[PDB]
Amino acid sequence: IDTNTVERRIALANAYNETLSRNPLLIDPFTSKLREYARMLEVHEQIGHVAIPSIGVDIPIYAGTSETVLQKGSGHLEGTSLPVGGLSTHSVLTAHRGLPTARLFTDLNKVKKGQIFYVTNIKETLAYKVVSIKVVDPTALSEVKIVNGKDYITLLTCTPYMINSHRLLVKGERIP
Ligand SMILES: [Ca+2]
């Protein structure tokens, strides 16, 4: 796609991000029951890719967290910022703590503070440095709000392994 088209679409994503309420009510995607909100970012139905070389993961990102999406890649939590970076953005990307055939976020618990993951979209590849690692009740995801003046992406999965009673949140902060 041509540069001028990419920039218009990114401008749309930014406008969307700057419209978001800073205080979503995020419901646990794993225990809950077709999305157009991220159409500007979509190429063949994917909005991006998330790579965590620290653990050998590189998987596609799709809009929403339907079970169809989570079977095949990472799902973007609607109500959070779209993964294009910027101040006052906080995107949440979700994936299973492993599937039969796919590692997905199986080893997210092995990511450490200071390590760097990458989110690639139609425009560029963004780098995020891990700054926090937390475990919370599934019924507590709303806290994962957009923080004024910060550019964050949280990677979200279930824990402990093979139990999945709780949720692991690994938050990275934009490296400018
Ligand atoms: Ca929609």
Residue numbers in the entry: 57 to 89, 94 to 236
What does the paper say about this structure?
The pilin subunits of GBS are assembled into high molecular weight polymers via a transpeptidation reaction catalyzed by specific pilin-associated class C sortases, through a common mechanism involving specific motifs present in the pilin proteins. The pilin-related sortases, which are integral membrane cysteine transpeptidases, cleave the LPXTG-like motif of the pilin proteins and, via the Thr residue, covalently join the C-terminus of one pilin subunit to a Lys side chain (ε amino group) on the next subunit. In this work, we present the high-resolution crystal structures of SrtC2 and SrtC1 from GBS PI-1.
The overall fold of GBS PI-1 SrtC2 is similar to SrtC1, with a root-mean-square deviation (rmsd) of 0.94 Å for 169 aligned Cα atoms. Like SrtC1, SrtC2 is predicted to form two N-terminal α-helices; absence of electron density for the first α-helix of SrtC2 is likely an artifact of crystallization that may be due constraints imposed by crystal packing or simply to local disorder in this N-terminal region of the structure, as commonly observed in crystal structures. The His156, Cys218, Arg227 catalytic triad in SrtC2 is conserved in spatially equivalent positions in all sortase enzymes. In GBS SrtC2 and SrtC1, the conserved catalytic His in the β4-α4 loop interacts indirectly with the catalytic Cys through the formation of a water-mediated hydrogen bond. The side-chain carboxylate group of Asp84 in the lid of SrtC2 makes a salt bridge with the side chain of the conserved catalytic Arg227, and the ring of Phe86 interacts with Thr154 in a hydrophobic pocket made of conserved residues. The pyrollidine ring of the conserved Pro85 in the lid also interacts with this hydrophobic pocket. The aromatic ring of Phe86 in SrtC2 forms an aromatic-sulfur interaction with the catalytic Cys that has been previously observed in other pilus-related sortases. Surprisingly, the ligand-free SrtC structures matched the active, peptide-bound, conformation of S. aureus SrtA better than that of apo-SrtA. In both enzymes, the catalytic residues are not accessible to pilin substrates, suggesting that the enzymes cannot bind substrates in this conformation.
